[PDB]
Amino acid sequence: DAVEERVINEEYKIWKKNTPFLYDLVMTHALEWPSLTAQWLPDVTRPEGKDFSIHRLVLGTHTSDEQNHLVIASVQLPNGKIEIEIKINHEGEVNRARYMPQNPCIIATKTPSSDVLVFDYTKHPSKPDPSGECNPDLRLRGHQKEGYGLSWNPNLSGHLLSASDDHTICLWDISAGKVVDAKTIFTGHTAVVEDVSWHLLHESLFGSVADDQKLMIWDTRSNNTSKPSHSVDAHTAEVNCLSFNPYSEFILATGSADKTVALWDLRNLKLKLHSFESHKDEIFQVQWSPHNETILASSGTDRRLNVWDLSKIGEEQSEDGPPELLFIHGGHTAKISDFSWNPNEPWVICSVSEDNIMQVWQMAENIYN
């Protein structure tokens, strides 16, 4: 034990030295506590006469026996400071936080208790109350254990999905600090459900992935909540994440403890389309580019964020990895817990790791052009 620390710190030294030719932007910020979660808010402000734009991030804390917070931070990007705008008292670490597309003041969170919380961040003071009391705007009941998966329906305002270690997926309709019981509980998985995500176009369709190694496709119009529409043996270990391609309605991607990202076609789930290989450990997040249909990213325990270009599947080569691996981000020296593609600046990513580091970065233009 502890030779690893020498290996990591030497590799970080090579990385640091090479950033001027690998990146168009690298901002590093040390949070007071690590964040398990990261999501860019949709808004950008471009003040007249300035050399920067102002973007914003939903973050959380993970403490060891100290008061946690849901956090909104501001980031200045050039055409660059990072500041905390608000902290709201949160009961336990923030497993995951996601804004509601139809009203981005509304943020859902996953707690270490079974509760899923809803905050309207405009209804909370500037400074958190030092009493420490968590006053969520809604408490969403239905789970028996904590989890990670959290998804707002982009086509039905207020329909929230959640995945838990209790083997279940819960659905709430918040549209009517009260307690809401789950509208529907889906019980098809036989193990910890790691992630859940609505389809971006079809208001009734969602996907889940679990430690049973399965990708499941659900339809809310089905009377049978114990059996999905489709059930796919997706990976040879736990499936930790999924993400629907925002330009291609039949395409999705899953990330796994088997160290691979799988590419799927909903119309024929018996045949995995491709397996993206290069991660050296468990994958916990995968996300498609909001700007480029063929671009996907993945991160996890190997301390790397990989960016893939599926248009390069099959091309010939002289190498250090397959042709579809566009970029390896090696800026983190600990496990990466989450990342978010900036929706207003193509190729900007924010990524957060267990050693308190948040990085906002952009690979060099010549790497993708």
Binding site: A30, E32, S64, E66, V192, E194, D355
Partner: peptide, 10 residues
């Protein structure tokens, strides 16, 4: 099922 690390301040 993920196992969260022990968080360190600063």
């Amino acid at each position: 099922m993920r196992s969260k690390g022990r968080a360190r301040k600063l």
